[PDB]
Write a protein that binds this ligand. Sequence first.
Ligand code: HEM
Ligand code: HEM
Ligand SMILES: C[C@]12CCCCC1=Nc1c(nc(N)[nH]c1=O)N2
Ligand SMILES: C[C@]12CCCCC1=Nc1c(nc(N)[nH]c1=O)N2
Ligand SMILES: NC(=[NH2+])NCCC[C@H](N)C(=O)O
Ligand SMILES: NC(=[NH2+])NCCC[C@H](N)C(=O)O
Ligand SMILES: [Zn+2]
Lengths: 405, 405
Amino acid sequence: GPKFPRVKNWELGSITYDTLCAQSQQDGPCTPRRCLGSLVLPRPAEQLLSQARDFINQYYSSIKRSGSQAHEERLQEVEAEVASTGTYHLRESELVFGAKQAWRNAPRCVGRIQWGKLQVFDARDCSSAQEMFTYICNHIKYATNRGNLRSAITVFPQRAPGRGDFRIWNSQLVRYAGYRQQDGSVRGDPANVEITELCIQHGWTPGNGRFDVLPLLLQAPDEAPELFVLPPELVLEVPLEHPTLEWFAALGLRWYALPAVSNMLLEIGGLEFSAAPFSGWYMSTEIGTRNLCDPHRYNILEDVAVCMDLDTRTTSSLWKDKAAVEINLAVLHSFQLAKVTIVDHHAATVSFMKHLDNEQKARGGCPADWAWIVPPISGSLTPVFHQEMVNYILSPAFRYQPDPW
Amino acid sequence: KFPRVKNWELGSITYDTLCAQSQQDGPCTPRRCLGSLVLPRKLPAEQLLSQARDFINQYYSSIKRSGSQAHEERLQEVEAEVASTGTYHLRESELVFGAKQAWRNAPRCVGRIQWGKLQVFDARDCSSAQEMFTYICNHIKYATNRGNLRSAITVFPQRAPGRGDFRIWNSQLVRYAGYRQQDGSVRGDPANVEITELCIQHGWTPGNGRFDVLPLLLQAPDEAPELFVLPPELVLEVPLEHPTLEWFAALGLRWYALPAVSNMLLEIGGLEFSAAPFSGWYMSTEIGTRNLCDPHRYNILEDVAVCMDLDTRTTSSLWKDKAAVEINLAVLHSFQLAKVTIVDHHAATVSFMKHLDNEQKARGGCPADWAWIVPPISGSLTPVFHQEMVNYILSPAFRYQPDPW
Ligand code: HEM
Ligand code: HEM
Ligand SMILES: C[C@]12CCCCC1=Nc1c(nc(N)[nH]c1=O)N2
Ligand SMILES: C[C@]12CCCCC1=Nc1c(nc(N)[nH]c1=O)N2
Ligand SMILES: NC(=[NH2+])NCCC[C@H](N)C(=O)O
Ligand SMILES: NC(=[NH2+])NCCC[C@H](N)C(=O)O
Ligand SMILES: [Zn+2]
């Protein structure tokens, strides 16, 4: 009966209707003619006001003062401010709310059961590249918490009419270098070739390992970016060993503890926070399957399978499968041993289902990007595989933005 | 705008121009993507005529005789026939062309490299359940070919305005019974509980095995369906054993050789063939991962993991992942040892890539459903994972249709 998408779980045989998608003010990439849901990235005045108004309405509802006098005054305040300056400012608790809602809204994040629990560092007073560095170091220190990781975001000043953006050039606060060789190949992480070369151009003296931590390239309004080396003792890393395969430690593979995305734009009520790095903790397949096994990343599957003495000349030995399992286990075992928070893809997906149930009750649905929610190994062994998902853009949101260069 | 499609492993970009030929709306709108949904929610002469004209045009263009006299007289024939009877009929060779094209256009099919190699049985001269059975038996006999599987479709008489459909009630020609036990459990295949029960009520003596091959319920128009036992010698099955684990074979697991979907509708030129069973050969994850390992299927993970002696008490030991690998490996080994055609998911997805390339040059695109093309284990270990895909409906097509009861 209901005129909303009907959503089915094929394992349990249960049914819901997503009513939340009705709240989407923004068109994604699909049309009746063709589905483009699999593409990683598909291609202000009165406009601001209506986005602002909507966000303020969201805030007052979440504190149950919808329609109140403090609500209508806040609205009046926001429009008067836009009326005379073309922009407006968020109250502190508004920014805290907006940041959590942005995470709550991110269709590609499987970790969202944790959305209510986010330390929000307000850095809207930041006025230098040097100061961004201190802020970032403070973030890393707090979030890492010696292995006992804590979700956090640091919000730098918003985009302003006429005035240059705050930007962190690095895609993450912590990344390994990728050095382009003479024999065409790459030492380190091929994903980071461009930012590696940019750091060099701005005077970084490069190393030559597979796991050199990149310096930060930080950009304050209308200034060239400045280079900052993270102090090694701030950057917690985990050496990878295997619970039973004694030779695996000899591979000298390692990963860092803190996944901290730093190139995304946080948009709240039409305001654009171009520098707003956030971090949680890893789900083990990000490291053990994507970062270590993607053919265009570290690509270690063949090396590991040879050590395991598997038949690499034939697909039907499932050598890639056997080696991926062991690499994934090594990631889990090594983080556990080191007392550094990590979550396996089974536990993570169980918890996303619970999140889906919470949100059905709370908002009538949950935007979710199936191809990103389902893990890159053991897909149908996890319950999310059997869950249909509706995908749509709600605001506040984290969005991709062009590289500053 | 023509969708830009990127491969992320290789950095290559294509533009899909084929999707412009789509005429039938899928489930997505710009407000929300529904691409992960398994079923569509929504399950005159001038319109049949336009689909017919288009299909005749496709046919004559295929044989290079586009614009010719034979082409002209054929469109005239089709017009003459619809105008005076509300419908028309296809020539054998046109039907042959349509069925291959339906396969080619099937977005959820990873085996489309094979699309041009399809044996087509014309069963349009069929007037009874009895004759359906003969036809179905010849198909099985042919497609099976002592283990050397050969792609085949048998096409029964089209739907007609006046009367009921020809239908095969079973979802595949060979399927195992599911017996609902008093205490809520299922003996045998849980996906087949309902069809198992329809056969019993239509008069079949059931067994009590986990792998009892079902009879067929065949329905000639406006008649009660009829029961037919397949002669056991026509149903090739593969006992499941493991290359190294001796106990595995003691599990008594087995599977049939011929995946022969019998519940989908074949639409060519606006004509609908409600009974048109098709078969190829299995991709091993269909058996090893979905049928045996799905929680709502035979759900054998725990059983195996205990045999392999794994720590079943915790998700992070990856017992599930370890067991799945051995089960898939056992399926490949057993099929190879019985000389029965099987393709592993690495070889299959590699051939799909090749197909995508052939289709890009030939047609300017390929409709593909990412969530179905990527295998249920080792997704990112296969090339298709990293390949963006556009999904849309082209005609001739295979469609879903209501269960006839
Ligand atoms: C608490 C532990 C967390 C876990 C296990 C988690 C898990 C994930 C995973 C597995 C992805 C997909 C990553 C990829 O394939 O590249 C993801 C993406 C995302 N996550 Fe979460 N997350 C967590 C915390 C957070 C926090 C605190 C935020 C924001 C405040 C967040 C927002 C996002 C966003 C915006 C994306 C999309 C990034 C992109 O599209 O490239 N996550 N997260
Ligand atoms: C040649 C050997 C073949 C292999 C290895 C192959 C592989 C596959 C696989 C893995 C799926 C996903 C099915 C699922 O998850 O249930 C699939 C679906 C499909 N295949 Fe192919 N296929 C082959 C031949 C064919 C032929 C001959 C046709 C038609 C003439 C065909 C048409 C389809 C259709 C219509 C679907 C969608 C089924 C559904 O929605 O449940 N396949 N095939
Ligand atoms: C596989 C696909 C879809 C499209 C191709 C590349 C992808 N990229 C990613 C993805 N999922 C996750 N979590 N991460 C990706 O980078 N999904
Ligand atoms: C996982 C998903 C997406 C939606 C939920 C159930 C599915 N069904 C299947 C699927 N892909 C394949 N190949 N087969 C399925 O049965 N995709
Ligand atoms: N768990 C997270 N918060 N992940 C954010 C994405 C991190 C990225 N996938 C990486 O492997 O570094
Ligand atoms: N290879 C094929 N033609 N598959 C069609 C679907 C068969 C279905 N996956 C099964 O496990 O029985
Ligand atoms: Zn879509």
